[PDB]
Design a protein around this nucleic acid. Structure first.
Ligand SMILES: Nc1ncnc2c1ncn2[C@@H]1O[C@H](CSCC[C@H](N)C(=O)O)[C@@H](O)[C@H]1O
Ligand SMILES: Nc1ncnc2c1ncn2[C@@H]1O[C@H](CSCC[C@H](N)C(=O)O)[C@@H](O)[C@H]1O
Ligand SMILES: [Mg+2]
Ligand SMILES: [Mg+2]
Lengths: 180, 291, 291, 184
DNA sequence: CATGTGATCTAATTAGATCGCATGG
DNA sequence: CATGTGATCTAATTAGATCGCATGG
């Protein structure tokens, strides 16, 4: 994932899954406020989506995944959001010959138990990083490079039970258009 | 959908069997005359592995728990020409009233098959042959059957063992094998009635038996739970060697590890109907080496 | 002592097997190539009878209890060319501290063999061939071995199965068979040491195992109770199919009647070493028809 | 068993084992006083006797068997007296063509239990007869022909323990006169 | 001084019955 | 209206270890 010159940085085209980050990605200027043709596709229920849908929804540069934020508005087990996120990711991934940068991200708002976490990091091929807090699996290099504040969760198990994960949306600027 | 291969360009088949059980896949392949170059089995039951190693004399590489198979393993152990599996259904089938679906309990293990299937898939630009198959019960929630078909991007074909065995066994079969929707035809060596599966001096009450599970109650037939066999005038349950003939396995196939009757039914109860699998793997011998 | 019979004058053999067990006698005769015209078996254990009827497909006539056989039955079921039997030794063998000897408990069943032998004996003036054999343990009171030899009017010959099998089995053999005192010689197909009887991927610690009884403790060898087999670097006991190969029976011979490990070892612990019995019955081919 | 005329009735050749009855047979008069070579052989522990021994002791006309009467001084198990009696009996019987009469009998002075009783009847091919008491297995016809007074065994069951043999079966030896010499 | 055609008592362990209901027949 | 790639709890039934000693080695 080499850095791209500023005069060539096309604007993003992201897919937001179960949680819409439009207003949050707008604030960081990744998309024109004038929406006219959408630059962000949002789907709340993936159950009936096929690969032919994601392919027809235009090529994607970012695929976002997120669990419900302890809202108890969950008619679905927590591992569902992970398995369905992995299913669409392969649908949205372009051909092996890479024409451009492709990034993906899945965040957990502290709803996955230890059993689901070991499944998540295994399906996403990397151990998660905790940003003080939410858990993050992503191929974005700065998220897995910038050492956030590291304190064990032996305290935040009973203690714990969006601006910080907005700062990890930021390192995508080096790759796409900046709007002010 | 995939072109034909000359009888000379046919190389031995390389199989990744997940949730291998008692090596039904290997047994069927070797009974069809197909050269098996490599057979990687993911299994965690000691007795199941004992069956596969003893009956097949160490031709099967056992690779314990599927959740510990990495992407490097699929490429080290690869390439694979065939990926077959049937995951546990105790949290999927309707016979368990406390089932947890495919997202909790042991139903998650389906996604392990889905996960390793994409690893084993030939990358784009590789027109080499590749076949896969996934088996499970028909008595699952339609929400489960829907999601399974979504992840595999394929719809299942149901094949009941009633057509080629002496037992009802209706199962779903996702896959891309040649001619899976074709009409199931019976063979001359298929034991179609329960009498053909019994021993000497034993009499069968029915021509067909209930779907055989791991529990001993599925041997008692009907709503009044009647014994299926009569010998010496007295009623009696099926024998292990008879259960094997019902499933299409060779006789004494599960006579290992000092297993009693209960253990041997536990392995057979969740296995595959051999003649059904043979009907599915039969068109593979036109893509891999003879023997 | 018995004159030779011309080959064309030979007729199929008629056998009376008392305490038949798992039909060891009939098995030996059939594998020797001797045509068996009639095989009357006195046995009371259902599982034992199940083995004999199933493995030999109803060629054996079972006559349930030996103490209920009458003189009329011997004449009706007769004539007999061979009268074989092994009396229960649970009250004779030295392995039982509370054994009751020959005149109480189960030892007195020997006299049933003595009683029915005289019934089957050819009457005075019948020079037709007639052979018999009685087997029992060596570890037996001297008074019992004395009295048994008196009632049979013959002295026993000890044949330890160690010479033709992988196990210690020292047994006494009363009889009038041709060449019983002859030196026991090993055959080309006798599995002489334990490793020849084990399954794939199993290693034998010893070359020869101690005497196998009906209890599971006799599988653990020595005075420090060692497991005789190593598998996957773990100590393990013998398997039923391995016990069968040790005794010389065909594989899966006792895979009958849903029997588990315990039941199958109980039937084999009582049985005869097949290669020993073949040694005894071998010179019978020159007196009866072949097939 | 045809009756034999008196002028050719030879004296008995008796084999008595476990219990000697020469005093009985002499009193009834089957054995002659100046006996000098006896016609009654008596052996106690037959454990080391062979067929040649019985054949050496000459042809026998009567083989008697008996259990120790109501005694605790028995080294042998009760069934031992029966099996050994049955063994020597086959040694005594002559060639198939029976020239003269051959009799045998076995007496139990209430020593054999039920389990041992069915064994005796099976081996001796005959159900016993009770004489008020002792049980008698015998091929002697008048001992199987005549009927003694029937006895309720349920009362005689507890009467066996009251003990805590010569005049009863003397009526059993009686009908042997018709086949052998009468001495007085 | 290690050995045994078994019986025993107790601890594991297994057998068998009951439970369970969406769903085509 | 009968069916089922099972889990449960409790009831029979094993599995396992200890027992036992005359005797050649
Ligand atoms: N985590 C895991 N990893 C690998 N195998 C597993 C597993 N969990 C369960 N299994 C095995 O998966 C099998 C499913 S039953 C299917 C058996 C097989 N299809 C046959 O024909 O016999 C069971 O034998 C079970 O032991
Ligand atoms: N009363 C009786 N009548 C007939 N058989 C009996 C009996 N009592 C015991 N038996 C049988 O006698 C056998 C003695 S063990 C000998 C088994 C046989 N020699 C073999 O080759 O296997 C046992 O199987 C037992 O079931
Ligand atoms: Mg299909
Ligand atoms: Mg001899």
């Amino acid at each position: 994932f080499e850095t791209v010159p500023v005069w060539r940085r096309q604007p993003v085209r992201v897919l937001s899954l179960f949680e819409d980050i439009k207003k949050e990605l707008t604030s960081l200027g990744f998309l024109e406020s004038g929406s006219d043709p959408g630059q962000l596709k949002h789907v709340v229920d993936v159950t009936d989506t096929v690969r032919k849908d994601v392919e027809e929804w235009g090529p994607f540069d970012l695929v976002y995944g997120a669990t419900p934020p302890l809202g108890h508005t969950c008619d679905r087990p927590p591992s569902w959001y992970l398995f369905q996120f992995h299913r669409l990711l392969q649908y949205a991934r372009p051909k092996p010959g890479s024409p451009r940068p492709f990034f993906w991200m899945f965040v957990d708002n502290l709803v996955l138990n230890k059993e689901d976490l070991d499944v998540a990091s295994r399906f996403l091929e990397m151990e998660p990083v905790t940003i003080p807090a939410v858990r993050v699996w992503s191929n974005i290099p700065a998220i897995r490079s910038r050492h956030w504040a590291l304190v064990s969760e032996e305290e935040l198990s009973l203690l714990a039970q969006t601006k910080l994960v907005k700062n990890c949306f930021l390192p995508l600027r080096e790759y796409f258009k900046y709007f002010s | 959908l995939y072109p034909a291969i000359p009888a000379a360009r046919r190389r031995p088949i390389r199989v990744l069997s997940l949730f291998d059980g008692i090596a039904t896949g290997y047994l069927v392949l070797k009974e069809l005359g197909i050269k098996v170059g490599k057979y990687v089995a993911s299994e965690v039951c000691e007795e199941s592995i004992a069956v596969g190693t003893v009956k097949h004399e160490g031709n099967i590489k056992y690779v314990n728990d599927v959740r510990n198979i990495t992407k490097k393993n699929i490429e080290e152990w690869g390439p694979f020409d065939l990926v077959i599996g049937g995951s546990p259904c105790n949290d999927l089938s309707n016979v368990n009233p406390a089932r947890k679906g495919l997202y909790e309990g042991t139903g998650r293990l389906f996604f392990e098959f889905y996960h390793l299937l994409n690893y084993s898939r030939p990358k784009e630009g590789d027109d080499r042959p590749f076949f896969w198959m996934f088996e499970n019960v028909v008595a699952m929630k339609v929400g489960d059957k829907r999601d399974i078909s979504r992840f595999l991007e394929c719809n299942p074909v149901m094949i009941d063992a009633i057509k080629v065995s002496a037992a009802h066994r209706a199962r779903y079969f996702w896959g891309n094998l040649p001619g899976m929707n074709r009409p199931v035809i019976a063979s001359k060596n298929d034991k179609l009635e329960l009498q053909d599966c019994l021993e000497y001096n034993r009499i069968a009450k029915l021509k067909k038996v209930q779907t055989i599970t791991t529990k001993s109650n599925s041997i008692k037939q009907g709503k009044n739970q009647l014994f299926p066999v009569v010998m010496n005038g007295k009623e009696d349950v099926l024998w292990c060697t008879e259960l094997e003939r019902i499933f299409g396995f060779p006789v004494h196939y599960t006579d290992v590890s000092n297993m009693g009757r209960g253990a041997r039914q536990k392995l057979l109860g969740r296995s595959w109907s051999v003649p059904v699998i043979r009907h599915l793997f039969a068109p593979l011998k036109d893509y891999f080496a003879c023997e």
